[PDB]
Swiss-Prot record, chain A:
Keywords: Chromosome, Cockayne syndrome, Deafness, Disease variant, DNA damage, DNA repair, Dwarfism, Nucleus, Phosphoprotein, Repeat, Ubl conjugation pathway, WD repeat. SMART domains: WD40 (SM00320). GO terms for cellular component: Cul4-RING E3 ubiquitin ligase complex; Cul4A-RING E3 ubiquitin ligase complex; nuclear matrix; nucleoplasm; nucleotide-excision repair complex; nucleus; perikaryon; protein-containing complex. The gene is ERCC8. The keyword Phosphoprotein applies. GO terms for molecular function: ubiquitin-like ligase-substrate adaptor activity. Gene3D superfamilies: YVTN repeat-like/Quinoprotein amine dehydrogenase (2.130.10.10). The modification Phosphoserine is found at residue 386. Substrate-recognition component of the CSA complex, a DCX (DDB1-CUL4-X-box) E3 ubiquitin-protein ligase complex, involved in transcription-coupled nucleotide excision repair (TC-NER), a process during which RNA polymerase II-blocking lesions are rapidly removed from the transcribed strand of active genes. Following recruitment to lesion-stalled RNA polymerase II (Pol II), the CSA complex mediates ubiquitination of Pol II subunit POLR2A/RPB1 at 'Lys-1268', a critical TC-NER checkpoint, governing RNA Pol II stability and initiating DNA damage excision by TFIIH recruitment. The keyword Cell inner membrane does not apply. It is linked to Cockayne syndrome A: A rare disorder characterized by cutaneous sensitivity to sunlight, abnormal and slow growth, cachectic dwarfism, progeroid appearance, progressive pigmentary retinopathy and sensorineural deafness. There is delayed neural development and severe progressive neurologic degeneration resulting in intellectual disability. Pathway: Protein modification; protein ubiquitination. This is DNA excision repair protein ERCC-8.
Curated annotation (Swiss-Prot), chain B:
It comes from Homo sapiens. The chain holds residues 697 to 795 of 1493 of the full protein. Essential factor involved in transcription-coupled nucleotide excision repair (TC-NER), a process during which RNA polymerase II-blocking lesions are rapidly removed from the transcribed strand of active genes. Plays a central role in the initiation of the TC-NER process: specifically recognizes and binds RNA polymerase II stalled at a lesion, and mediates recruitment of ERCC8/CSA, initiating DNA damage excision by TFIIH recruitment. The gene is ERCC6. It is found in: Nucleus; Chromosome. Disulfide bonds: none annotated. This is DNA excision repair protein ERCC-6.
Length: 386, 99
């Protein structure tokens, strides 16, 4: 540390280096609930989490109960230990509440005043955050597994919806259009994800074992089908020997991660679909529904956090190296989300907990001359062989 | 625009059923919405100028177009009345024949 501080003060190293090094060290030090609980509002499993992109203060949660909960993550108490309290909820008393489990919540990418929700009740809903009233509602023939709004598109406001139907659907919130379908897939579409680099490029994953990249401006059909063997454009390509149930672009958009029920994670070049041949080993993935997982941002290494049964596995994206297993939950983890500002990970599970994983690099320090106001050696940490 | 059956259910029926003067207020609103949605979906891909929108391509002289309502002659009225009182028209209204 003191070396980094000296090098920064003297301009020997760019201020980038201390910042990225310490961010990486913090990710390596994640510990369960060290400073922080999250308030138990849900009665069911936590299907989905989304941290607000503007300030990172607020987290939406959706669950198998159909409830949507909005949490405040900032410690506005003066204590070193605190609870992330629920600001407000769309509970079962609300008229517009979802009838069946809520499978994706996403903030509007450009300000916090609106958010979107989807559910196995075959709806996509648009919510006014200040009032928690729906502004628009879209209905579908089939249960929605996933939806996404483009994180970078200013030009268009399209929601991609993946359903049990074989056709991807696109809803235009500006016009209210929901007629536009993409017709290339053959089974249920389990994950959809817009490129963070390009306004118009949508990745889609399906139980047909295919990941397809689309340019939604075109009348032409899809661009690229990912072939895990690298050899041919559509006739037989598969990304996994199983269902493909999760997508995550890397934070630069240059690669796409995919996870599937073959228990493998695979890294792809997003500009042409080449399998980069990074091998992570067995990544346990039994999930028959979409799996949400996340990369880090702003670290010296790009990490990926992936549900691994009841654990969260951490890998280095490019090296394939398994770094740690975060070992908290009692049932399968369904989502995790990364707070980029402070390198804190939140995780939802079918055990109904939301758990915070927080960098725990060192303890509060005593003064040895104190009587009892020290940083206490609690007797729970003591042996008792007598 | 999706598949034809879906398009018919989402636009053709709602927009048609709100053109009637006996359409209920909910139908009139639903039609107005569906027409706005359809018009916004097709707009980028349909380019349509009218002659009133652009005076560059000359101008036509004025058109007077009128509808003249004629009467049936008495024998024509008999023939028509006897046909609508016919059992062929009964078979038509009873669904035994196509209209």
């Amino acid at each position: 540390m003191l070396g980094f501080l000296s090098a920064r003060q003297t301009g020997l190293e760019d201020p980038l280096r201390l910042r990225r090094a310490e961010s990486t060290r913090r990710v390596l030090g994640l510990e369960l609930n060290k400073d922080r609980d999250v308030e138990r509002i849900h009665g069911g499993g936590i299907n989905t989490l989304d941290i607000e992109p503007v300030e990172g203060r607020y987290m939406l949660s959706g669950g198998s109960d159909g409830v949507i909960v909005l949490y405040d993550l900032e410690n506005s108490s003066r204590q070193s230990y605190y609870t992330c309290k629920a600001v407000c909820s769309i509970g079962r008393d609300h008229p517009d509440v979802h009838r069946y489990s809520v499978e994706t919540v996403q903030w509007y990418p450009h300000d916090t005043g609106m958010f979107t929700s989807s559910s196995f009740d075959k709806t996509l809903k648009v919510w006014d955050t200040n009032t928690l009233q729906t502004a628009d509602v879209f209905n579908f023939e089939e249960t929605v597994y996933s939806h996404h709004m483009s994180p970078v598109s200013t030009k268009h406001c399209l929601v991609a919806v993946g359903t049990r139907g074989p056709k991807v659907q696109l809803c235009d919130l500006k016009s209210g259009s929901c007629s536009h379908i993409l017709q290339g897939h053959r089974q249920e579409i389990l994950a959809v994800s817009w490129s963070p680099r390009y306004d118009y490029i949508l990745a889609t994953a399906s139980a047909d074992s295919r990941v397809k990249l689309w340019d939604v401006r075109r009348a032409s059909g899809c661009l690229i089908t990912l072939d895990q063997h690298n050899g041919a454009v559509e006739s037989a390509n598969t990304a996994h020997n199983g269902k493909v149930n999760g997508l995550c672009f890397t934070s630069d958009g240059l690669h796409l991660l995919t996870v599937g029920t073959d228990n493998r994670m695979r890294l792809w070049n997003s500009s042409n679909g080449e399998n980069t041949l990074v091998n992570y080993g067995k990544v346990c993935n039994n999930s028959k529904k979409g799996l949400k997982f996340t990369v880090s941002c702003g670290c010296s290494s790009e990490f990926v956090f992936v549900p691994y049964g009841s654990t969260i596995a951490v890998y280095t994206v490019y090296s394939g190296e398994q770094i740690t297993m975060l070992k908290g939950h009692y049932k399968t983890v369904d989502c995790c989300v990364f707070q980029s500002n402070f390198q804190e990970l939140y995780s939802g599970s079918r055990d109904c907990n939301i758990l915070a994983w927080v960098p725990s690099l060192y303890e509060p320090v005593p003064d040895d001359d104190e009587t009892t106001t020290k940083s206490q050696l609690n007797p729970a940490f003591e042996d008792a062989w007598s | 625009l999706g598949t034809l059956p879906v398009f018919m259910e989402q636009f053709s029926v709602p927009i048609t059923m709100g053109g009637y003067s006996n359409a209920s207020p909910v139908q009139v609103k639903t039609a107005y919405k569906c027409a706005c949605v359809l018009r916004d979906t097709i707009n980028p891909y349909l380019l349509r100028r009218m002659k009133s929108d652009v005076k560059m391509s000359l101008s036509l002289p004025d058109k007077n177009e009128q509808v003249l309502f004629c009467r049936l002659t008495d024998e024509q009225h008999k023939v028509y009345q006897n046909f609508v009182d016919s059992k062929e028209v009964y078979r038509i209204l009873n669904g035994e024949m196509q209209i």
